[PDB]
């Protein structure tokens, strides 16, 4: 039993006294197909992972009412005091060591997540929650996908609408037909840069301005990347602009830490294949202070998204979610 305090952005998330905990209500959870599918994914992802840098479900409330009348899902989580957006963009400290440590934990979480063939696809400071003990936890897995996706999804083709514009990888923006865990490392690059300057790296107002801002720092993309652009009109737009060499990161962040900018430069690249992985980034000298491979596990077995590729009705998705809630309780008790 619980007692509610105040409404906390993250849907209907309420602060509740029991020690304090977070309770998230998913109202009318089975009314819309896309929403219901998303809840099923999130439940399955968060039950799969067991990692101190990934948000964990602490409890799920079972239906008090009969099955038909079961309309809303209540999920209980550990109360986090803040998120990385609020920390960065406020009056509290954010030294280089804060940056170093927050980056370390994010990458630690991603190594584990990525080894299970799960791409978050929506990493940004507001999805990185921080408790009062400074533990960073990755949340909001609604956008996450595997390496394989069904054509039935609109996002399969319309990749430039995936997730948040300010943190969206070039492969998604330009539809480069290479969608790997590297998607997340671009986003990490953006978060890392944002931590160093305390302002967003690429705050684009629209599709074209977003590409402008990326090019103003990274320069014009290579012919291989340009030809890999699916849309002729985007391809033509890029070819119309004059040539531009990459701006060194030393200039973009004057007086910043050398090893930090070294690591940043290995994240923010146009080509997904060129980017450092989460695992390899943990071995970078910038994170040597915290790095310990024995305390940085992979996830086994891999996560399978097959359940999400099925064309299920609302009622069939409700059934799957209820089976996950039953299973949550059945494993422990």
Residues with active-site annotation: 122
At closest approach, how far in Å is the CB of 20 from ligand G9E? 10
Considering only residues 111-130, where is the footprint of ligand G9E by CB under 6 A? 129
Strand stretches in 62-196, DSSP E: 73-78, 82-83, 128-130, 136-138
Which parts are annotated binding residues?
A: 8-13, 24
Tell me the two tokens of residue 254: 């004057």
DSSP 262-311: HHHHHHS-SSGGGSPPHHHHHTSGGGTTT--GGGS---SS----HHHHS-
Q: Judged by CB under 6 A, which of 36, 42, 108, 109 binds ligand G9E?
A: 42
Contact 88, 272 (CB under 8 A): no
At closest approach, how far in Å is the CB of 1 from ligand G9E? 19
Per this entry, what is the length of the chain? Answer: 333
Q: Judged by CB under 6 A, which of 14, 24, 89, 290 binds ligand G9E?
A: 24
Site mask, ligand G9E, residues 50-89, x = CB under 6 A? -----x-----------------x-x-x-xx-xx------
Q: Judged by CB under 6 A, which of 122, 140, 171, 194 binds ligand G9E?
A: 140
Among candidate residues 201, 131, 140, 138, the one with its CA nearest the CA of residue 168: 201
Name which of 22 and 320 has its Cβ closer to ligand G9E. 22
Say how far apart CA 212 and CA 18 lie, in whole Å: 50
Name which of 46 and 260 has its Cβ closer to ligand G9E. 46
Say how far apart CA 328 and CA 322 lie, in whole Å: 10
Name which of 24 and 314 has its Cβ closer to ligand G9E. 24
Say how far apart CA 326 and CA 333 lie, in whole Å: 11
Name which of 55 and 176 has its Cβ closer to ligand G9E. 55
Peptide bond into 280 cis (omega under 30): no
At closest approach, how far in Å is the CB of 8 from ligand G9E? 4
Tell me the torsion sign for CA atoms 102, 107, 108, 110.
Answer: positive
Taking the mean position of all CA atoms in its chain, how far away is CA 287? 21
Say how far apart CA 7 and CA 101 lie, in whole Å: 29
Q: Judged by CB under 6 A, which of 36, 43, 54, 191 binds ligand G9E?
A: 43
Say how far apart CA 221 and CA 96 lie, in whole Å: 31
Contact 53, 295 (CB under 8 A): no
Considering only residues 91-110, where is the footprint of ligand G9E by CB under 6 A? none
Which parts are annotated binding residues for ATP?
A: 8-13, 24
At closest approach, how far in Å is the CB of 100 from ligand G9E? 23
* 187 phi and psi angles, rounded to 5 deg: -60, -45
Find the part of the chain contacting ligand G9E (CB under 6 A) among 18-26, 145-153, 195-203, 302-310.
18-26
Q: Judged by CB under 6 A, which of 139, 189, 193, 221 binds ligand G9E?
A: 139
Applying CB under 6 A, the site for ligand G9E has a residue count of 21
List of residues contacting ligand G9E (CB under 6 A): 8, 10, 13, 22, 24, 26, 39, 42-43, 46, 55, 73, 75, 77, 79-80, 82-83, 129, 139-140
């Amino acid at each position: 039993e619980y007692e509610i305090i105040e409404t906390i952005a993250y849907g209907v998330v309420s602060s509740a006294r029991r020690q304090q905990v977070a309770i998230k209500k998913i109202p009318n959870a089975f009314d819309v197909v896309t929403n219901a599918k998303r809840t099923l994914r999130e439940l399955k992802i968060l039950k799969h992972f067991k990692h101190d840098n990934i948000i964990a479900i602490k409890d799920i409330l079972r239906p008090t009412v009969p099955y038909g009348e079961f309309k809303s899902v209540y999920v209980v989580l550990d109360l986090m005091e803040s998120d990385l957006h609020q920390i960065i963009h406020s009056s509290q400290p954010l030294t280089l060591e804060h940056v170093r440590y927050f980056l370390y934990q994010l990458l630690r979480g991603l190594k584990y997540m990525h080894s299970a063939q799960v791409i978050h696809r929506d990493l940004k400071p507001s999805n990185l929650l921080v408790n009062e003990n400074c533990e960073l936890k990755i949340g909001d897995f609604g956008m996450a996908r595997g390496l394989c996706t069904s054509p039935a999804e609109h996002q399969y083709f319309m990749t430039e609408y995936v997730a948040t514009r300010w943190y969206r990888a070039p492969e998604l923006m330009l539809s480069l037909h290479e969608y790997t865990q590297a998607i997340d490392l671009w986003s990490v690059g953006c978060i890392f840069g944002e931590m160093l300057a305390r302002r967003q790296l690429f705050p684009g107002k629209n599709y074209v301005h977003q590409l402008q801002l990326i090019m103003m720092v990274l320069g014009t993309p290579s012919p291989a990347v340009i030809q890999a652009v699916g849309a002729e009109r985007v391809r033509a737009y890029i070819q119309s602009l004059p040539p531009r060499q990459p701006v060194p990161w030393e200039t973009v962040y004057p007086g910043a830490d050398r090893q930090a900018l070294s690591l940043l430069g290995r994240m923010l690249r146009f080509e997904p294949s060129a980017r450092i992985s989460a695992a390899a980034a943990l071995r970078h000298p910038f994170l040597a202070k915290y790095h310990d491979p024995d305390d940085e596990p992979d996830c086994a077995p891999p996560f399978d998204f097959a359940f999400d590729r099925e064309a299920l009705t609302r009622e069939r998705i409700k059934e799957a979610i209820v089976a996950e809630i039953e299973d949550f309780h059945a494993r422990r008790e």
